[PDB]
């Protein structure tokens, strides 16, 4: 209205970036949990109708070949991101014949955010929300950036509507120590508990990023159907 | 940082443009009167006050060889248009080797003048132009409003009092007349909404041979 | 917010024309030009316009000046905002050097209000940018050999004058130059009497008497076609004749 | 509603916003330039960092310079006036690529007058705030001192001051005729004027928050800063003065 | 506002000028489209003034390429010039890859452009939501509907514009997955008309196929709707 | 702050409209009316002028309908000047595709072609729309007689008979009244000047505050008549015969 | 004052202009740092913000060059910005020619960055303030603010709760000038301890100076010098 | 610049105990005319910095404005006499130059030594430094002495002595032969005379008129110039 999108509040924040926060709380919850054996990213698919090819609508995408990430917030946006994080890598992997660090990628994407602000183009943040997770030389890890630009190192995190129980749950029953199969039983549990549903197939995405291959992996209904059985 | 200052009201109206056209009605009358061999173009100002050099603020100004024009309004407005059409006039005998017909001047200078209705970070023109001609299609008499909008005319005033004088015209011009008699018709119109008596040097006249503007003495001789 | 920006009010006024005019009538400074038979004469008041900042003790003086070269030959006095005044003078020079360039000869002092007028205008009509408060006289020799004097103001008005004002007074100045030219009615004795009479012009319209020391005159004519300020002790002999009867 | 904008007349002909730069500069650390017998002195007193323990001594410096012999210094924000010193810098670095000789002082003052000047005109940019001090001395013209405000408007001085308590500076200043005083003598005087109108400045901090320079024949008529071998007697002498 | 961001994050969170081609699309002319084995039916309301409107001039139902076509509910201009876009882009791709536009890159375009366009300076977004029905470069059919936001997703079967909720309701317990053409258009016109009056003058329906997209004549609409009076009474 | 002076005319209101596109059809609502309508010998267009004064020149001056092209003519409402702009962009575009093509421009895609124009400025930038409504006759071969009606948004529609400008809907409703599809030129001019007649509440049309043109093809050659006083008087004449 | 805080090329009747002014208020709730130096070494340390108990600490001091670091305190984004634009500054000086950049001619350009950003209204003041510390011939700690303006100091800090680190360092800066590098490392440590426990995880710390290059302290070096703090 | 018109001769510089001596005959030659033979080619960059040329008489113009300039802005930013630009930092400025200009295809037909001395620990010059104004002589280690040539294709390298043009031959050989560490001033002088005899004697373009300038511990001097004895 009446506050450029470059206004500063009194309190030394931005307007824009403030209220854009608040676009990421609104989405369906993801959760990430990063493991010595690897990162998984776990998500609810709250599908509308059944009319929806439910496959369309992807809430768990990849940024490369050993990286991974789950969006909240604006989806729309949330996709000109990840395009642009796409593009970026295989960028960097033409240029250096190697797969790109988990943090390069998230602060290149960060950087594209606020791109608004014009310090040295798009005109609004962004007002996503998203868990990266991917494996590296040093290892898997999992990040979350915001619209705000910061970018942070997470063992564990969630997104999205239910982002406080899924954290408080994830903080309560996540340790440093637990095994890949172990953190496929946290993310699913943590996600039944916060979920409104009965947790079937074609009701949560998931999906893995091993230190093994340093591949994305996309689950299929057996293996849903595999942890769901294990499940207590 | 580019935007209209110019926009359109709730009714529809483009309050800027209705603001200039204010300003025109308030500014000094001119007139224009078109007869069958010939065309004039008539304005008035305040007498001098025994200072101002009077051949350094004429009105009406010589466009082409057969093409003149006056104005009501603001006079920077008009330098800058004048020195446009001057330009485009000379654009034309650049490209066809011939005078500017007055019917493409008008519409150049018309849409020029649009212009600065829509595009961004400018206000209208404040004034109101007569351009006068003759070309091979005949004589014209043109007005055009700070809207862009022109109209042929046949005889015209375009400033103070213009409805005033705008009926005098009426009851006195016919489509047949002598110059001589569109000259005496465009000073009694002038002299009859002047504030006092109207003499030699409140009048300006030019005349369309190529655009004459008519001299102190002229305009006396026809003040007899 | 029409009378924020050099757009039309509901009455078809500019106010911000008239608030730069406004400005100019604030500096309480006096420049008259008035112009001989083969003469023109320009007198400024030689003091700092009225401003934030006041006349400090230690300020030189002599570097005060309202009056300007543009060429070798045509001159003016400039009137309001000082950072305005100077920016047209430099502008004046550029459209001046220009001409010269491109048309190989010398610009007159008419074509040069022109130019700057429609300068000017540009300014009254674009939004994005403010009016120079600022009010000018200028003068020359035209190529026919008679002065040239012309005068311009913030809204974009050229006009040709045998005298002019500008200050905080008119219609009293106007009546004052009109006295004494009409009561005027050899090129030393022509130069001599326009000087005289634009000095006389001054001191009445001020209503002071005038010291030489803060008054500067400037004048071109036939005799020495360059714009050039006379000194102190000629304009204090001229003010010595006054009162002489 | 008229003083919103710096591109804006009010109805009495002010242009508000460069009258409130001129109460920012009047708020700002205080400098002065003084014509004296054989040079011309510059003096920038930064009272306003007597709070500030831990800055470094003599770290803060307004006081610049131009060809190596010509002062500039300043009164009003820090970025804005090296943006105009960078400005004066290019035009001397360009007057002489063109013509081979240095800038005369009055037309880079007029340039640099034009360039804050310009920034008074459009609604988008922020006008400069900053007064701008500008001055050299040679042994056949003595000394030219000029003092360029935010408005655009340049004045010639034989002394000037800008800044906090600038009145009571020129009045101590006026209180004698400096183009018969050397400099050495007049650095005891303007620590004595400091002492006495500066209420934040004392013995303690004199030697720490006041820049000192000079254009004189000592310095061969060249840009220097002050000894401390010059500085501390003129001090001391102040202070028993005082 | 040569570049001035027109779309703002408002303080809740939104962005308003979405919501507001949001609404710039409710008030639009209903359309609907239902998806088969291996071709699909595309139903869009149309209304015109009796016996001085040319009906022919107003198309809702476009061709965008050899294979695809679009349904669109919204401003009339802006579903203009988006098409003129996504059919310069269709041949555009076909120059760069030497193979027609799949569906779902072209879905993808169009969803590009509507969410450019709420994050640029100086640009409205578009006031207009789509339904976009092609085959992909595996030969499978799909349709795709896009919204102002730039938020698409393939639909088995789905409705825009006015009233789209009430049609979505009836598709949703009338669709049955794999159908013979004519059920086809029946169902697509019965939903339709749930909420548009039931006449053959207010509808046009085509079937795309893969060899072209066909117009259905409209002495069949007449015969439905007079299925579909008897239906109801 | 620029911004605060910046209407946002290309800013949607919640309802999903365009302000400054609805203001412009309201100046359009209240310009004076024309009328278009398709006859099986060719296409009419007329209009009501505004009478401003007796002494226009009224001998071969027409401010409603104007020619595009030797196939293409249209008759404007709303303000006259914007109605120019585009009058001459459709004459360039109409060119152009005879300099691209070497063969004439089908009447749709000039239309196409100038209500892109007209959309363009309510979807970008900051610009006001412009203020016009376009009833565009034609011919061509692919599709024969054609009439359009364009408007501010760049929408546009295509019609057999229509009106706009004020008393729109009184015309339209005459004309659906009274038109019909195989009708002669004469019945198609009668009808217009009833439909002029109806909308303007008056009894009997006056020739001095009609336009009327038309345009057919014979002889595979597209002909366009702007009928003068004369004629028209003629075809008054006739009509209260009827 | 709603009237002038609206945009950042406004002056107050104040003569204030109160959006650089809301810039450099950002940098107070960024986490606290601290900076000093003797003789021959500067010391940066810093707290490093932890967001929740899952989360990692996010970095607070970044290596510019060889001999030059820096601490940000304010919107992290700005500070890459001008983290970025420094080591290339630095690189490209070591690019054209064969030495080390300037410190202060460094610091001056980064200062010309944050001004220019003041200037017009489509742009706005970074929201961060930087602490640079560098050997370049003896050490020395600059800081530069939203305003354009840049200083040098003894001794600095700023951020969250800075004031008891500012008090700290106002009763021992005499010290700092003989202590030998543990004993600043010390000094430093505890200044940053008074703005607060410390822990591996939530303390950054640097070192640069004579002979030295820009090292931040490992982690089982600061867990020694953090007992001996404690 | 197509090609040179108005050309300089050899310059040769060597080191010596106390410093740089470079020398250059004063002429400049308009092909096979000795139009010019009072020519200064040997310019002045600071007080511990000089620049000789041979080539083109415009080209090096162009570039000792440059370097003038240079020199000027350094001195505006300077606050200690360690903040100079040292004989290095102005050959590799003027390599850059080269090298961006055979890039361009538009080079300065030129071959240019820039010498001087690198450290500032031998003199206080540069504390107070004098532009429009002019003990022993202290013995200078050669590491703290920079000569360095550049050609016209970037071509740039540092040595003991350098020459230009014919000198590359004819004094060339002799310095590889003669030259010794630590010379006194009148040794360099000696060999410097004996090989401007020979290009004297062998080289066209060149003049018996020589200027000497030396860059001690004192500055730059610039001797009287001379005829060359016998």
Same mark, same amino acid.
């Given at each position: 209205y009446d506050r450029g999108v470059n206004t500063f509040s009194p309190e030394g924040r931005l307007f824009q970036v403030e209220y854009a926060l608040g676009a990421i709380k609104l989405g369906s919850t993801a959760v990430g949990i990063c493991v010595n054996d690897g990162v998984i990213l776990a998500s609810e698919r709250r599908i509308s109708s059944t009319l929806i090819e439910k496959d369309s609508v992807e809430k768990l995408l990849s940024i490369d070949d050993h990286i991974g990430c789950a969006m909240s917030g604006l989806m729309a946006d949330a996709r000109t991101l990840i395009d642009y994080a796409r593009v970026e890598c295989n960028h960097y992997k033409f240029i250096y014949n190697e797969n790109i660090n988990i943090k390069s990628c998230v602060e290149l994407i960060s950087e594209l955010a606020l791109d608004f602000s014009n310090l040295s183009i798009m005109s609004r943040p962004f007002g996503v929300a998203l868990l990266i997770g991917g494996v590296d030389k040093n290892g898997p890890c999992l990040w979350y950036t915001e619209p705000s630009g910061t970018n942070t190192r997470f063992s564990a995190a969630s997104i999205g509507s239910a982002q406080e129980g899924a954290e408080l749950l994830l903080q309560e029953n996540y340790k440093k120590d637990m095994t890949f199969e172990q953190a496929e039983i946290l993310a699913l549990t943590v996600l039944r508990q916060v979920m409104e549903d009965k947790l079937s197939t074609s009701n949560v995405e998931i999906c893995a990023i091993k230190k093994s291959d340093q591949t994305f992996y996309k689950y299929n209904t057996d293996d849903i159907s595999r942890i769901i059985d294990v499940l207590p | 940082y580019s935007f209209s200052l110019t926009t359109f009201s709730p009714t529809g109206k483009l309050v800027q443009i209705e603001y200039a056209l204010n300003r025109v009605s308030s500014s000094s009358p001119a007139l224009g009167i078109r007869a069958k061999n010939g065309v004039i173009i008539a304005t008035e100002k305040k007498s001098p006050n025994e200072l101002i050099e009077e051949n350094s603020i004429f009105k009406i100004q010589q466009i082409s060889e057969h093409i003149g024009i006056v104005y009501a309004g603001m006079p920077g407005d008009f330098r800058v248009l004048l020195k446009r059409a001057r330009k485009e006039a000379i654009r034309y005998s650049l490209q066809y080797g011939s005078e500017i017909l007055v019917k493409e001047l008008v519409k150049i200078i018309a849409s020029i003048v649009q212009e600065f209705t829509q595009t961004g970070g400018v206000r209208p023109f404040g004034l109101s132009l007569l351009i006068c001609g003759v070309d091979v299609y005949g004589y014209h008499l043109y007005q055009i409003d700070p809207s862009g909008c022109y109209f042929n005319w046949m005889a015209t005033c375009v400033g103070k009092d213009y409805q005033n004088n705008m009926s005098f015209l009426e009851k006195r011009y016919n489509k047949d007349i002598e110059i001589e008699d569109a000259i005496h018709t465009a000073i009694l119109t002038l002299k009859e909404s002047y504030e006092g008596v109207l003499n030699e040097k409140n009048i300006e006249i030019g005349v369309a041979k190529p655009f004459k503007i008519l001299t102190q003495n002229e305009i006396k001789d026809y003040l007899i | 917010y029409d009378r924020h920006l050099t757009i039309?009010?509901?009455?078809?006024?500019?106010?911000?024309?008239?608030?730069?005019? @406004?400005?100019?009538?604030?500096?309480?400074?006096?420049?008259?030009?008035?112009?001989?038979?083969?003469?023109?004469?320009?007198?400024?008041?030689?003091?700092?316009?009225?401003?934030?900042?006041?006349?400090? @003790?230690?300020?030189?003086?002599?570097?005060?000046?309202?009056?300007?070269?543009? *060429?070798?030959?045509?001159?003016?006095?400039?009137?309001?905002?000082?950072?305005?005044?100077?920016?047209?003078?430099?502008?004046?020079?550029?459209?001046?050097?220009?001409?010269?360039?491109?048309?190989?000869?010398?610009?007159?002092?008419?074509?040069?209000?022109?130019?700057?007028?429609?300068?000017?205008?540009?300014?009254?009509?674009?939004?994005?940018?403010?009016?120079?408060?600022?009010?000018?006289?200028?003068?020359?020799?035209?190529?026919?050999?008679?002065?040239?004097?012309?005068?311009?103001?913030?809204?974009?008005?050229?006009?040709?004058?045998?005298?002019?004002?500008?200050?905080? @007074?008119?219609?009293?100045?106007?009546?004052?130059?009109?006295?004494?030219?009409? @009561?005027?009615?050899?090129?030393?004795?022509?130069?001599?009497?326009? *000087?005289?009479?634009?000095?006389?012009?001054?001191?009445?319209?001020?209503?002071?008497?005038?010291?030489?020391?803060?008054?500067?005159?400037?004048?071109?004519?036939?005799?020495?076609?360059?714009?050039?300020?006379?000194?102190?002790?000629?304009?204090?002999?001229?003010? *010595?004749?006054?009162?002489?009867? | 509603g008229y003083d919103l904008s710096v591109s804006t007349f009010s109805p009495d002909g002010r242009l508000y916003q460069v009258e409130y730069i001129y109460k920012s500069i009047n708020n700002n650390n205080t400098a002065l330039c003084l014509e004296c017998k054989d040079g011309i002195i510059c003096c920038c007193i930064n009272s306003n960092m007597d709070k500030n323990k831990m800055i470094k001594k003599n770290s803060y410096n307004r006081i610049y310079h131009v060809n190596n012999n010509i002062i500039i210094t300043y009164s009003g924000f820090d970025g804005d006036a090296r943006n105009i010193i960078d400005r004066a810098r290019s035009e001397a670095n360009t007057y002489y690529y063109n013509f081979h000789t240095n800038i005369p002082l009055h037309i880079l003052v007029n340039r640099i007058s034009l360039y804050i000047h310009a920034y008074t005109l459009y609604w988008h940019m922020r006008p400069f705030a900053a007064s701008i001090i500008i001055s050299s001395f040679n042994e056949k013209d003595k000394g030219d001192i000029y003092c360029i405000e935010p408005n655009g408007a340049c004045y010639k001085y034989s002394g000037i001051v800008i800044g906090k308590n600038k009145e009571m500076f020129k009045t101590e200043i006026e209180k004698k005729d400096y183009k018969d005083i050397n400099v050495r003598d007049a650095i005891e005087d303007i620590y004595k004027f400091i002492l006495t109108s500066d209420d934040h400045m004392n013995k303690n901090n004199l030697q720490n928050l006041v820049n000192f320079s000079w254009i004189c024949k000592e310095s061969s008529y060249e840009f220097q800063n002050i000894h401390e071998e010059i500085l501390t007697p003129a001090l001391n002498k102040a202070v028993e003065y005082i | 506002s040569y570049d001035r961001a027109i779309t703002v994050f408002s303080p809740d969170g939104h962005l308003l000028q979405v919501e507001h081609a949001l609404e710039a699309v409710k008030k639009g002319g209903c359309a609907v489209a239902i998806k088969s084995s291996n071709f699909a039916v595309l139903a869009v309301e149309k209304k015109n003034i009796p016996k001085l409107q040319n009906p022919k001039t107003t198309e809702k139902l476009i061709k965008l390429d050899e294979h695809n076509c679009l349904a669109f509910a919204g401003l009339n201009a802006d579903a203009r010039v988006l098409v003129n876009k996504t059919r310069l882009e269709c041949q555009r791709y076909y120059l760069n890859m030497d193979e027609p536009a799949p569906v779902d890159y072209i879905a993808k375009y169009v969803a590009k452009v509507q969410q450019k366009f709420t994050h640029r300076g100086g640009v409205r977004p578009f006031g207009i939501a789509t339904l976009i029905a092609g085959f992909k470069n595996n030969k499978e059919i799909c349709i795709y509907q896009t919204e102002p936001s730039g938020i698409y997703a393939a639909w088995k079967a789905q409705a825009i514009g006015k009233n789209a909720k009430i049609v979505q309701e009836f598709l949703e317990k009338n669709y049955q997955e794999n159908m013979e053409q004519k059920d086809c258009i029946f169902l697509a016109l019965k939903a339709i008309f749930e909420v548009v009056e039931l006449s053959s003058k207010n509808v046009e329906v085509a079937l795309l196929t893969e060899k072209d997209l066909t117009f259905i004549e409209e002495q069949e609409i007449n015969s439905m709707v007079e299925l579909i009076d008897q239906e109801r009474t | 702050m620029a911004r605060r002076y910046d209407s946002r005319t290309t800013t949607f209101s919640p309802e999903g409209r365009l302000y400054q596109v609805e203001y412009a059809l309201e100046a359009i609502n209240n310009a004076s009316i024309t009328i278009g309508l398709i006859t099986k010998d060719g296409v009419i267009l007329g209009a009501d002028k505004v009478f401003i004064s007796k002494l226009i020149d009224k001998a071969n001056n027409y401010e409603k309908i104007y020619k595009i092209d030797k196939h293409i003519f249209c008759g404007v409402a709303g303000l006259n000047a914007d109605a120019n702009i585009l009058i001459n962009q459709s004459r360039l575009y109409a060119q152009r595709y005879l300099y691209n093509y070497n063969e004439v421009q089908p009447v749709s895609q000039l239309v196409v072609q100038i209500c892109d124009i007209k959309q363009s400025y309510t979807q970008y930038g900051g610009l006001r729309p412009y203020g016009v409504s376009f009833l565009i006759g034609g011919y061509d071969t692919k599709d024969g007689y054609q009439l359009y009606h364009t408007d501010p948004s760049g929408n546009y529609s295509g019609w057999f008979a229509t009106a706009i400008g004020t008393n729109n809907l009184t015309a339209s409703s005459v004309l659906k009244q009274e038109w019909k599809n195989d009708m002669t030129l004469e019945e198609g001019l009668l009808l217009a000047l009833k439909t002029l007649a109806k909308s303007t509440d008056t009894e009997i049309p006056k020739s001095e505050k009609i336009e009327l043109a038309y345009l057919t093809n014979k002889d595979g050659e597209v002909y366009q008549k702007y009928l003068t006083e004369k004629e028209i008087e003629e075809l008054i004449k006739l009509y209260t015969q009827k | 004052r709603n009237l002038y805080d609206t945009d950042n090329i406004i002056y107050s009747p104040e003569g204030r202009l109160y959006q650089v002014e809301y810039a450099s208020e950002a940098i107070k709730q960024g986490t606290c740092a601290v900076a000093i130096k003797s003789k021959d070494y500067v010391v940066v340390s810093g707290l490093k913000k932890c967001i929740s108990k899952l989360s990692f600490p996010q970095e607070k001091i970044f290596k510019i060059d060889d001999y030059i670091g820096i601490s940000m305190s304010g919107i992290t984004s700005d500070a890459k910005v001008l983290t970025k634009f420094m080591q290339n500054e630095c690189l490209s000086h070591k690019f054209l020619y064969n030495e080390n950049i300037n410190i202060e001619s460094l610091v001056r350009s980064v200062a010309d960055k944050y001004q220019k950003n003041t200037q017009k209204s489509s742009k706005r003041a970074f929201g961060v303030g930087l602490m640079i510390a560098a050997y370049h011939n003896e050490p020395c700690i600059f800081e530069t603010r939203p305003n354009g303006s840049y200083f040098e100091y003894d001794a600095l800090s700023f951020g969250a709760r800075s004031h008891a680190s500012k008090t700290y360092l106002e009763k021992n800066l005499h010290l700092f000038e003989e202590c030998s590098l543990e004993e600043l490392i010390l000094h430093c440590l505890k200044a940053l301890k008074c703005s607060l426990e410390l822990t591996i995880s939530n303390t950054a710390l640097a070192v640069v100076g004579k002979n030295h290059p820009w090292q931040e302290i490992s982690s089982l070096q600061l867990e020694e010098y953090l007992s001996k703090v404690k | 610049t197509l090609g040179p018109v108005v050309t300089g001769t050899s310059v040769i510089a060597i080191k010596y105990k106390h410093g740089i001596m470079i020398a250059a005959d004063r002429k400049a030659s308009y092909g096979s005319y000795a139009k010019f033979q009072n020519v200064e080619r040997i310019f002045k960059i600071n007080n511990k910095t000089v620049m000789g040329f041979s080539g083109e008489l415009a080209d090096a113009q162009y570039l000792h404005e440059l370097l003038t300039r240079k020199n000027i802005n350094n001195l505006s930013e300077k606050k200690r006499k360690e903040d100079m630009y040292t004989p290095q930092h102005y050959h590799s400025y003027v390599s850059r130059v080269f090298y961006v200009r055979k890039n361009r295809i538009d080079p300065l037909f030129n071959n240019i030594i820039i010498a001087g001395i690198n450290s500032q620990k031998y003199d206080n010059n540069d504390d107070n430094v004098l532009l429009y104004t002019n003990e022993e002589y202290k013995e200078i280690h050669k590491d703290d002495l920079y000569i360095g040539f550049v050609d016209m294709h970037g071509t740039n390298f540092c040595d003991d002595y350098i020459t230009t043009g014919y000198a590359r031959y004819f004094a060339l050989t002799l310095l590889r032969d003669h030259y010794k560490d630590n010379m006194t001033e009148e040794e360099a002088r000696i060999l410097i005379n004996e090989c401007l005899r020979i290009l004297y004697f062998r080289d066209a373009t060149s003049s018996n008129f020589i200027q000497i300038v030396k860059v001690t511990s004192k500055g730059v001097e610039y001797e009287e110039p001379y005829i060359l004895p016998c």
């Open positions: - | - | 039309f009010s509901p009455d078809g006024n500019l106010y911000q024309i008239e608030y730069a005019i @406004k400005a100019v009538k604030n500096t309480n400074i006096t420049s008259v030009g008035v112009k001989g038979e083969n003469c023109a004469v320009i007198i400024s008041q030689k003091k700092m316009a009225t401003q934030y900042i006041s006349q400090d @003790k230690l300020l030189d003086y002599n570097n005060i000046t309202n009056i300007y070269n543009i *060429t070798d030959e045509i001159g003016c006095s400039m009137v309001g905002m000082p950072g305005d005044c100077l920016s047209m003078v430099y502008k004046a020079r550029s459209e001046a050097s220009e001409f010269l360039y491109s048309n190989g000869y010398n610009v007159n002092a008419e074509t040069l209000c022109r130019n700057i007028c429609d300068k000017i205008q540009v300014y009254t009509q674009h939004a994005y940018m403010r009016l120079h408060a600022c009010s000018g006289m200028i003068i020359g020799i035209d190529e026919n050999n008679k002065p040239e004097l012309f005068k311009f103001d913030p809204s974009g008005f050229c006009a040709g004058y045998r005298a002019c004002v500008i200050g905080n @007074k008119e219609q009293e100045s106007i009546s004052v130059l009109e006295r004494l030219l009409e @009561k005027r009615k050899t090129i030393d004795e022509d130069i001599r009497n326009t *000087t005289i009479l634009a000095i006389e012009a001054l001191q009445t319209i001020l209503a002071f008497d005038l010291k030489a020391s803060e008054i500067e005159v400037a004048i071109v004519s036939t005799k020495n076609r360059n714009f050039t300020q006379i000194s102190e002790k000629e304009i204090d002999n001229y003010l *010595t004749y006054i009162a002489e009867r | - | - | - | - | -």
